[PDB]
Design a protein around this nucleic acid. Structure first.
Ligand SMILES: [K+]
Ligand SMILES: [Mg+2]
Ligand SMILES: [Mg+2]
Ligand SMILES: [Mg+2]
Ligand SMILES: [Mg+2]
Ligand SMILES: [Mg+2]
Ligand SMILES: [Mg+2]
Ligand SMILES: [Mg+2]
Ligand SMILES: [Mg+2]
Ligand SMILES: [Mg+2]
Ligand SMILES: [Mg+2]
Ligand SMILES: [Mg+2]
Ligand SMILES: [Mg+2]
Ligand SMILES: [Mg+2]
Ligand SMILES: [Mg+2]
Ligand code: NA
Ligand code: NA
Ligand code: NA
Ligand code: NA
Lengths: 103, 183, 71, 142, 66, 83, 144, 152
RNA sequence: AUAGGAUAGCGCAUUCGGUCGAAUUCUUCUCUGCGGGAUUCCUUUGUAAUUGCACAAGGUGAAAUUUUGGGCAACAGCAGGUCUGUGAUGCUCCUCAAUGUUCUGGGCGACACGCGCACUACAAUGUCAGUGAGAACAAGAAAAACGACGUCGAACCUACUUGAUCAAAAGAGUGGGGAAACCCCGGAAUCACAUAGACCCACUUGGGACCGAGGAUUGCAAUUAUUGGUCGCGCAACGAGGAAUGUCUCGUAGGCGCAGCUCAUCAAACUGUGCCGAUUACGUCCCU
């Protein structure tokens, strides 16, 4: 009905991103705004494969380093002031929350 | 309204029986439409014996790097082979194939210490018969005008008759002769 | 192989000793009891404990079991 | 093509001082001529109006003359300049298509010119070595 | 020519490399035949198991127990 | 030495690439009497190339002197007409 | 206003996923990715797909519109996934709009012929490990 | 008998007949009508640089135009690059491993231009090509003719 | 049908991702943070037991034995490798015509030969020329610089169009994507085709090594060819490879491509990914 605001929550920590998403949802439910639903975007895995040795001797063994990225989005039809009030709380370290207005 | 399968919708499986009293439980006469089932036949020790015999022939045709994994091609070659077998024998090509497999392997071999004559298990007889017939047909068509289905048909028919013109029969006679000499 | 390690066997013996009256010959009900009466990270370990716990109960009905002391 | 063998069939056909097998199909018998590949032979057949399905042994003298004429002067028969094996001669600056012994002679001329100017490629040819920058170590091994 | 026999017991893999199986074979003949229910020990090449069937040809030689 | 394989040799074939009166008449007469007809077989009997042998087999099929049993892009199998 | 009789099932083989929409229509019409069965090539794969019909009989498939959309995998895996979706779709439709003697006699016939007509094959590609060119093939070793 | 309608079935559309048989029939119609524009470079060029020899069928351009028309029917809004992926091939690189190469977009551009002059393909809104109503009508009517076994 | 076989349809005929329609309804497919699910759980005229620990077949089931594949991994050692990773390092050497540091040029590529590891082949279960259906893992652009008036805007990847009133490769124009958003409905190649296509056993339309000529492209610079593309060269061996020898038991071997990584330009390498998919054994201590 009104303008739509998009909350993008991204983090390297699965526990942190889930807790922030739940806190945002609970605060939105307290404010009685119409939220669409927290959508879990596909998890992205940054993979780096390197040779274990620093000199190049012996059996050619490798190290597979992986970094996983979790992303969530929440859509709610609330005035920018209300979304600022909902977003205004203490988040965990390493969690990024972005504000986007849908057109 | 459910009818029995016929291989390539042309050849009937009714009465398909091996004349050999042995190999009866190791040659599968289950009806099928095509020699292509994505079954896990190698999971158990003797599960491969239950696989349909024509599909086993199709797998035997999938040798060498240029033939590895071409099962649709093997099915097409077998379809033409069965048509040629019917024209040559005026008999059910499924029965001709069954007879060729039943007679295509030696019953006695030599092993081992000195060489000693031993019997051959029925599973190996079926396995070797398919292996040698495919080997003979493949090597015959290597640099020859005659196509592979024609070479395969001639090998199967000669093996079914027990003729020495078959590559598998020739090897079977040599192995049995050596095994007899090693008694 | 499927040999139960001493961790599973010791835990199963303790579970039978402490909760004999609540157990029976069914793995699934025995497992449900074990989730509540035991603390462990491994679901696989709890399932293994339940399996041997059922085995101990079956042996107990036939006769005494060494290492199982039911007061 | 179910056509009976003609009385004038030749198993060996003379074309540009080259023995051409009359058993082969027309484009794949023209490629036996030095300077004419599979692509060039198909274009020669197209410009000569000869059905490519025919065997080369059935070619008459007039068609052989037309084929020789087209191979000699492809540009006259509307063959594009990018289709010719010598588009701008380093000595003459002319576009032409070498054929038969002309290819070998011009290759000898090119080697002589490079070895006369003492260029690096000429020195490599004189020493019988690879000229295109390939690693000759662990390569060739006659 | 060849006499059919039934493998009633697998005695065990024999010989170096374990490729030969020693089995007990009952000759399959009609009642009253001289070979009726005659059991002999044989050495088998290839994968075999109990209740398999063998074509023995000669039925006189007996495999040495191992 | 340098060449370890024996490198056996075979007698070359002299299959004709263009039909002639005798072979064409043989194809029109004796071939329709064969139970199994394939271009490779016809090439062997008539000492002709498989390409023209297949073309001749196609012509008989259109004329209905022989019938086609198994057909593929690369494989053609024929047989004599019933009776 | 006649009611809508429709079910949706899926078949899987390797990566290929086939989704079959089965509905009651004027007459039987089965298509894979918008292509009728008689236009599916090669004949070997067409026969494999047709096994879902001929095993139980076309009478149970009469007056059924089946649309199968397949994505992923290859031509062989897609055909196997499609035939599984068709067989499961017939079972699901009979489960929803028939009784239990049906959808069981049909299920027994399907399972007696081929278990994979209804139950998916769990086999998947094994990951490649380092120091190997594939899942199992190690690098070539030389000693001198 | 064979061309008898199965029952309760009327007409035919594309994807309901053999793809090659439709393409051959459409190419035959193009050649028989003799209104399509055939570039002169088609008698001298290869369909793509990934091929090693020129097309052997003299009517290859008519076949390619028919295939392009059917491809546009299946994939409205497709461009030259999308068609190039459809008509690509594996290339022989010599003693080096083979690799896939997309077809040259030049002949595809010529084919789309020829189909446009025929009034069958139009530039789709926001890029790409699409069939006109005339092209959709032509494709489906030809599909019915294929099913009826007219073939020209 | 040119000769046109086989292959399901028998209250409402099908089709239209550009029809850049409009309303509804929904979660079968997809995404995923936590859960569930499998353990010897069930049954043997079984092996064993006279106890136990267990084993083997079958059952149940998506999965039936460490579920599958990985990661991690003790204690003792090696004068193994690395001072060519580090502002990690003792001792020692050079230190203003320097063993520091730049710039120019050459070399690391240089070939009578020997060896490891790959790629391409020796062809018809094929090569060409067409047509069809069709994956997955992934990558993508820049500042305390510069241009525009504390914000974009060009570096990167792409789609479409044009070039095109006439080869490829190019060159251009417009649009999109910070990447489940554009690429993309990811038209990969093996593969398939009743394509009524060409070739027909020959170093041959097998095989493309070597070489010649034109042109374009990356780069400050292409000669010792950077790399594509065109026409020639194919008369370079090679027709299946001696003694020896490597890897491998299930979606595995083998084949088949794709992405990433090195990267201004260049993969026959590697790291991953999917596609087609078997033979054999499920045994032993003979060899090691
Ligand atoms: K070239
Ligand atoms: Mg294509
Ligand atoms: Mg090749
Ligand atoms: Mg190559
Ligand atoms: Mg290759
Ligand atoms: Mg040392
Ligand atoms: Mg130091
Ligand atoms: Mg070096
Ligand atoms: Mg092939
Ligand atoms: Mg070639
Ligand atoms: Mg320079
Ligand atoms: Mg150049
Ligand atoms: Mg050659
Ligand atoms: Mg490297
Ligand atoms: Mg040992
Ligand atoms: Na051959
Ligand atoms: Na070397
Ligand atoms: Na190595
Ligand atoms: Na089961």
């Amino acid at each position: 009905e009104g303008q739509t605001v998009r909350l993008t929550i991204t983090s390297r920590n699965a526990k942190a991103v889930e807790s922030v998403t739940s806190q945002l949802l609970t605060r939105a439910r307290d404010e009685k705004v119409t939220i669409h639903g927290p959508v879990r975007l596909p998890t992205r895995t940054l993979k780096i494969t390197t040779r274990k040795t620093p000199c190049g001797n012996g059996t050619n063994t490798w190290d597979t380093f992986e970094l996983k990225i979790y992303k969530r989005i929440i859509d709610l039809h609330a005035p920018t002031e209300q979304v600022k009030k909902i977003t205004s709380f203490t988040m965990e370290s390493g969690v990024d929350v972005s504000i986007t207005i849908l057109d | 309204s459910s009818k029995t399968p016929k291989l390539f919708n042309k050849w009937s499986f009714e009465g398909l029986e091996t004349s050999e009293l042995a190999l009866r439980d190791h040659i599968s006469t289950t009806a099928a439409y095509v020699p292509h089932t994505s079954g896990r036949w190698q999971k158990r020790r003797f599960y491969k014996a239950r696989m349909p015999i024509v599909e086993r022939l199709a797998n035997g045709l999938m040798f060498k790097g240029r033939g590895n994994g071409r099962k649709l091609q093997a099915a097409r070659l077998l379809k033409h082979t069965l048509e040629i077998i019917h024209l040559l024998t005026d008999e059910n090509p499924l029965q001709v194939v069954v007879d060729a497999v039943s007679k295509g392997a030696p019953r006695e071999d030599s092993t081992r210490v000195r060489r000693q004559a031993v019997d051959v298990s029925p599973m190996r007889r079926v396995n070797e018969a398919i292996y040698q017939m495919c080997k003979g047909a493949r090597e015959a068509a290597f640099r020859n005008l005659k196509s592979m289905p024609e070479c395969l048909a001639d090998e199967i028919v000669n093996a079914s008759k027990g003729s020495s013109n078959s590559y598998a029969i020739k090897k079977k006679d040599e192995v049995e002769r050596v095994a007899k000499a090693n008694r | 192989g499927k040999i139960r390690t001493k961790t599973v066997k010791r835990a199963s013996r303790q579970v039978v000793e402490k909760y004999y009256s609540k157990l029976n010959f069914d793995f699934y009900q025995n497992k449900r009891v074990i989730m509540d009466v035991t603390i462990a990270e491994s679901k696989k370990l709890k399932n293994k404990i339940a399996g041997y716990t059922t085995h101990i109960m079956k042996r107990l009905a036939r006769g005494p079991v060494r290492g199982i002391s039911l007061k | 093509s179910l056509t009976l063998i003609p009385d004038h069939f030749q198993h060996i056909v003379r074309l540009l001082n080259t023995n051409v097998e009359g058993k082969r199909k027309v484009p794949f018998a023209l490629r036996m001529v030095k300077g004419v590949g599979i692509r060039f032979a198909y274009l020669v057949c197209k410009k000569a109006g000869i059905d490519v399905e025919r065997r080369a042994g059935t070619l008459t003298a007039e068609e052989l003359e037309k084929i020789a004429e087209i191979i000699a002067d492809p540009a006259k028969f509307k063959i594009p300049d990018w289709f010719l094996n010598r588009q701008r001669d380093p000595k003459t600056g002319k576009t032409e298509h070498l054929s038969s012994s002309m290819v070998d002679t011009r290759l000898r001329d090119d080697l002589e010119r490079l070895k006369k100017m003492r260029a690096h490629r000429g020195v490599r040819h004189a020493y019988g070595l690879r000229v295109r920058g390939q690693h000759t170590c662990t390569s060739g091994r006659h | 020519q060849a006499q059919v026999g039934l493998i009633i017991k697998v005695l065990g893999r024999t010989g170096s490399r374990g490729n030969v199986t020693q089995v007990r074979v009952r000759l399959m003949a009609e009642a009253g035949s001289p070979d009726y229910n005659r059991t002999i020990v044989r050495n088998v090449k290839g994968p075999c198991k109990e209740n398999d069937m063998l074509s023995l040809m000669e039925t006189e030689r007996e495999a040495r127990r191992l | 030495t340098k060449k370890w394989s024996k490198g056996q040799s075979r007698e070359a074939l002299q299959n004709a690439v263009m039909f002639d009166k005798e072979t064409y008449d043989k194809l029109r007469s004796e071939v329709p009497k064969y139970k199994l007809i394939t271009p490779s077989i016809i090439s062997d009997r008539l000492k002709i190339a498989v390409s023209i042998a297949a073309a001749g087999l196609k012509q008989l099929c259109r004329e209905k002197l022989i019938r086609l049993v198994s057909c593929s892009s690369k494989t053609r199998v024929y047989t004599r007409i019933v009776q | 206003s006649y009611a809508l009789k429709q079910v949706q099932t899926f078949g899987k083989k390797k990566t290929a996923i086939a989704v079959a929409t089965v509905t009651k229509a004027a007459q039987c019409n089965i298509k894979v990715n918008g292509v009728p069965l008689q236009q599916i090539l090669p004949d070997t794969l067409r026969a494999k797909i047709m096994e879902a019909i001929t095993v139980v009989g076309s009478k149970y498939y009469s007056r059924l519109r089946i649309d199968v959309a397949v994505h992923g995998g290859g031509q062989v895996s897609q055909a196997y996934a499609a035939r599984q979706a068709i067989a499961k779709g017939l079972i699901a439709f009979f489960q929803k709009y028939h009784n239990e003697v049906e959808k069981a006699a049909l299920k027994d016939k399907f399972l007696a012929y081929d278990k994979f007509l209804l139950i998916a094959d769990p086999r998947r590609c094994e990951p490649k490990k380092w120091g190997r060119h594939s899942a199992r093939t190690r690098f070539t070793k030389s000693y001198r | 008998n064979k061309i008898h309608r199965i029952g309760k079935r009327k007409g035919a559309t594309l994807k309901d007949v053999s793809a090659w048989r439709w393409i051959k029939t459409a190419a035959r119609h193009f050649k028989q009508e003799g209104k399509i524009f055939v570039p002169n470079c088609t008698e001298i060029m290869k369909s793509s640089h990934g091929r090693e020899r020129a097309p052997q069928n003299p009517d290859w351009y008519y076949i390619r135009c028919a295939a392009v028309l059917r491809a546009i029917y299946l994939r409205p809004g497709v461009g030259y690059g999308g068609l190039s992926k459809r008509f690509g091939n594996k290339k022989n690189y010599g003693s080096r491993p083979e690799h896939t190469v997309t077809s040259s977009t030049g002949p595809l551009h010529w084919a789309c231009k020829s189909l446009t002059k025929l009034g069958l393909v139009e530039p789709g809104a926001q890029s790409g090509q699409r069939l006109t109503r005339k092209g959709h009508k032509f494709a489906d009517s030809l599909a019915f003719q294929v099913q009826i076994r007219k073939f020209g």
